[PDB]
Design a protein around this ligand. Structure first.
Ligand SMILES: CCC(CC)CN(C[C@@H](O)[C@H](Cc1ccccc1)NC(=O)O[C@H]1CO[C@H]2OCC[C@H]21)S(=O)(=O)c1ccc2ncsc2c1
Lengths: 99, 99
């Protein structure tokens, strides 16, 4: 689809078998989801945002279906203000900015 | 133009007579610029992201050129690590997400 920006670009995603709402975030390098359980091994990591650094759990090679499009990649889980889809997965679904 | 998301979508902007690099950021409601001593009235604001909140100064009706496209609106100035063009200006320059 083409998505305009007068509203937040929120979309439904499917991950670990569950549906969630997430924000398409071109300013995020990484995909970061609010606290949730995911299967398999994870690694402790830290990432920084506008307000400082947080601790996250890094899960690699995780399938997510974003607005009907498949991605498989790194998902960070931790105290983000909102679920965000970052560039690591936006690239997989062929997302570009256009003006 | 079309901007892919393999790298950060940094573009050149001009504001208050300075040229800067800034993110075209669909995850940002508002535009947030690195500390700069702009003239005019402002209002204090707090904005939240990963890590917590920062304190910013809200300036209204500031002209800003983004990749050659003129815009005018609210800009928040404070200790962000990156200049961020948010949806309030992205809409003015006709920017969409496409996949
Ligand atoms: C609430 C939704 C997100 C935070 C999740 C909002 N951010 C915009 C992001 O695009 C931000 C923009 C950003 C970019 C770089 C540094 C700081 C902020 N990116 C960001 O936090 O990305 C993190 C995940 O991937 C990593 O790559 C970049 C930082 C990490 S923000 O910068 O905090 C932000 C910007 C404008 C704004 N207007 C009103 S509240 C508000 C908050």
């Amino acid at each position: 689809p083409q998505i305009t920006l007068w509203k937040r670009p929120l979309v439904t995603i499917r991950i670990g078998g569950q549906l969630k709402e997430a924000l398409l975030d071109t300013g995020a390098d990484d995909t970061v989801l609010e606290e949730m359980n995911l299967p398999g091994k994870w690694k402790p990591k830290m990432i920084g945002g506008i307000g400082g650094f947080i601790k996250v759990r890094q899960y690699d090679q995780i399938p997510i279906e974003i607005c009907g499009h498949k991605a498989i990649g790194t998902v960070l889980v931790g105290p983000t203000p909102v679920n965000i889809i970052g560039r690591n997965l936006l690239t997989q679904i062929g997302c570009t900015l256009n003006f």
